[PDB]
């Protein structure tokens, strides 16, 4: 029986399961039972897979359109001369700051309506803080571009990255793209800054120290030292990036240092986020994904 | 056990191999133990010997195209060897066309599940079309056949691992190469894409001008840190060069994050069904094959 | 909770927090109902706060030593007769700052030393911390030493402290779940499953260093260091494989090359799936009731502090 | 204990050590009780004085060997400096330990009498051991002969002792069972997980270079280099600009890449998935069979 469950005009369950925060315990598995199960996919097969494939569409439209608004910029303002290229470049960026400012007055409607837990925020509205953010720094540059400023390219490329990468949100109805963007949210959220916690520190410290030793050179400064050191990572270190010291056996001894404590390091992270393989890693994100397209769901039926 | 090979109306073997992706359980559908005997037996009898002998024919042939092709000087004892290598360079080709072709008429595939079957099948056919349109280019008059023949030496090359079948080892890891490929190739390559064309397109839009500008090198040099390869320096025709370092970082960290979780997926995820799914997916194979030498 | 925590000459917690680890399972007392809920009302009452300060102030130590190190005057033959300006005055305090600082860390170590007494060997399989921090302070003081003998060894030894309680920042890791449960698995790593092949590949190396090294004849590359060095690289994806061609048989030299690039490579292959088969499944828990343990002991010094 | 340890007829621990590997589970049989208590006694009694004994004359040995090698100035002439005198003991001393071991090794093959199929199954050590006693012996012999593929010879015996320290890394528990999962994994995974990448290599590398027209690297040797110089993190992918249109070029090497990262990471899955169960047992097993199988020959010696 369907009484209440979508339309008490009040509260309906599936409503009240979809909506609930972090605070809810057994959330993610909640909709395993079988009247929300077959429910949710009788709706989404009927009627919100095309309404979603269409909105992906035009989304991607959209990003196609900036991206080529923005690549061919001129080398601020610029006044628009007569060409088909100038047309075609002014209504692009006229239509990329209109899906700005659409994104922004979206996001602030979801805002006032949810006022997020002001803890849950990340961990929940995921991607919907990302689009804000977006719609923010796209904001940004045009305020910029019209203040004469030449960092309103700096604000756009950042938009335009951020957008690039906000396609993962459209994964969802596919099962295992979505199953991936969800393990991509999800090892972010949980590793990606204890990780980092960790590897920072190293980074600084023994940033400091040859730098420290450095007498003089180019690298004499910690922020060129910095990118140096880093380097090792990305698999392109040096070891001999400077010549200009002196106890040179110091110098060698805390680069070994540095790679054997960051190798071991790189070795941890990668194992030690192994997450609940087999365990509980193949039904945790599968349930993780059918509540957030349920929310989808919702959320394209009340729209 | 009758109808089970020759019945001239259908088999038990006749079915299970060329059933089509639908079926439920048909490589544990072997795993009953008359059929796995009955099957070992035939290999040993017979289908060992001609497998081998094919497997040696065709690393000949393969080594006479290679030879072939690496001593090339169009159209146009050196160069009898190298004309006769050709000829019977084509005539391979030519062959393994025709045996796609006759394959494909007696298949009539579901033209859905067609790559997950047959991998082995639609690869020679498409190795065969590469190399006749070289030789079709090679006689017109053109020298785009060197860039279409090569594309088929590296193909053949690498379905030489077609023959790992017959062998334990090396036949249950190419069945799991071919099947990471086919159903995992995409999980990883489609979310790669979009975010290297997403920081590719920051990127070139924040360089002012210079020899990076070009949308292809700064794509091609984000890529280069995937390999290992980077450089965070490449071009320094630009301003705001903390916008450039934080956006290289940021990819950086994105494609760790992207590498790593794909690691994490097919890991976790498949760690431990291998060691049954694996063997029986080759035991289907090799029935397949089997069956394929023994009707021929 | 009679004899629990305070009895002036024993209790349950000091021996259990200060028992040797020749103890077979020191670790599992602690999830005993009382004491865990204990240490969670004593931790959350007041060591929170406590242990919190204490982190700050050691990250500002860091952050004042660290500054005045970078802006060190490199003129040659300290001591230096300082120049009247602001800046100097600023580096002159940072100086002492944190020569007090090492001095003060020096005191605390030798002071725990007697605290503990341990049994000149159970100090190397616990007490990690302590010993690191005694011997940064160690280096603080020869560095000063150095300093004041008319001696430019002092950059050396204040570099070398510098890195080492950068490192060492990690012991405040403590009260943070995740974060000390990381640090743990860490160092349960760096001192179980490094070394293990960390012997192996120097092994491998030096005997493949040293064979190429006797092929070289002459050059920047026929030394011992520079040819270690240079087989070191393909470790960390640097690789040259062209490195000289002052030698003979070319084919040599390439297959060597090649054998010790796969052996290398296999080598670290098994490094990740040992690891992986061990700790693993083999540490959570054991990791969890370590940090357990160091929390434990941490509130306890604290207190007794 | 009786008729377990020495009849001159037949006992039950040396009838376990030297059986061939045929057998279904050497592994497990001495895991009962008298047989595992007895051999870490006897063990712990003397052999590990006489086993760390003999690892401290090896070791000696391949530092003098090393020496020896390493200040080579044929044959050579000796001068008036005790230096010379110090290179020619060390040769001396080196050659008569490979002499020794060549000995040692055609005295085992006699005495045991391998299968010629169970030749690398088992007995790996004792194969790699003849076979650097080998290369030292065909370095003297071409050293004598006024040649000069000596040094390849000789470079060849010196890593392999160096790398053949390994099996003195026996004896004790965590490095002798690590040592255990390398050599397994080198005998029963490399051939099958190596024959893959060289095919892969080598026809990417043919199809490049028949692509390319000229240039220094229109061989094949250089082509294949630059293919390999991918796979330790160092590939250019510009290497080259002298060949048709790059497009085929750039889809060529892209390939190779996609194609070798899918083979390295099965290749990983694969030997993970299929050992991570049992490399708590059955290295462990394997590691005391091979040391029970050095009591034994330390004891019978
Ligand atoms: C060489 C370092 C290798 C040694 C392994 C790492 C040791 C380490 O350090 O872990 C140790 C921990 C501290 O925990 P603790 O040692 O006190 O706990 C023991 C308690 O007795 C009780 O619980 C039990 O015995 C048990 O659990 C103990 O682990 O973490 C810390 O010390 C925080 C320090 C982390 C930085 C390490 C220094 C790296 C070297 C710097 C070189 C400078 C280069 C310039
Ligand atoms: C640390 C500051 C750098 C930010 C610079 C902006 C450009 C970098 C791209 C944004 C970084 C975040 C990338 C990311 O991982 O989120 C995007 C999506 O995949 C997440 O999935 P979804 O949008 O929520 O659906
Ligand atoms: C990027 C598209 C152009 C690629 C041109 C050719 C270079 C790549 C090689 C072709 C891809 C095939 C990859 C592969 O792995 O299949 C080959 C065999 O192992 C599969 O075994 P089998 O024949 O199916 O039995
Ligand atoms: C002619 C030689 C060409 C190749 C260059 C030399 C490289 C040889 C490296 C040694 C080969 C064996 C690989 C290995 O694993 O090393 C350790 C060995 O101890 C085997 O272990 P163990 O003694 O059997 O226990
Ligand atoms: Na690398
Ligand atoms: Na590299």
């Not at 196609?64 to 601020?76: D, H």
């Not at 390219?153 to 991936?180: E, H």
């Amino acid at each position: 029986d369907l009484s209440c469950i979508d339309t008490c005009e009040k509260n309906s369950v599936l409503e009240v399961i979809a909506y609930s925060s972090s605070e809810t315990p057994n959330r993610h598995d909640m909709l395993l039972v079988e009247p929300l199960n077959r429910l949710l996919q009788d709706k989404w097969d009927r009627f919100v897979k095309r309404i979603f494939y269409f909105n992906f569409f035009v989304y991607c439209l959209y990003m196609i359109i900036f991206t080529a608004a923005a690549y061919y910029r001129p080398v601020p303002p610029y006044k628009l001369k007569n060409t088909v290229g100038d047309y075609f470049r002014v209504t692009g960026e006229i239509l990329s700051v209109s899906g700005g400012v659409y994104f922004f007055f979206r996001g602030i409607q979801y805002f006032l309506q949810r006022r997020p837990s002001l803890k849950s925020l990340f961990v929940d509205s995921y991607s919907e803080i990302l689009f804000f953010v977006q719609s923010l720094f796209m904001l940004v540059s045009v305020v910029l571009y019209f203040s004469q400023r030449k960092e309103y390219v700096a604000s756009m490329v950042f938009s335009l990255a951020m957008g690039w990468t906000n396609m993962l949100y459209y994964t969802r109805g596919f099962q295992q793209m979505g199953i991936y963007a969800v393990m991509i949210e999800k090892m972010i959220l949980r590793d990606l800054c204890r990780f980092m916690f960790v590897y920072l520190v190293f980074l600084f410290g023994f940033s400091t120290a040859v730098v420290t030793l450095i007498e003089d050179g180019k690298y004499n400064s910690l922020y060129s030292t910095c990118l140096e050191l880093f380097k090792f990572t990305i698999g392109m270190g040096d070891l001999e990036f400077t010549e200009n010291y002196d106890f040179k056996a110091v110098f060698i001894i805390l680069l070994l240092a540095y790679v054997i404590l960051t190798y071991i390091l790189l070795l941890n992270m990668l194992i030690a986020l192994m997450g609940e393989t087999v365990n509980k890693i193949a039904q945790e994100s599968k349930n993780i994904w059918k509540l957030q397209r349920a929310i989808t769901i919702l959320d394209t039926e009340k729209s």
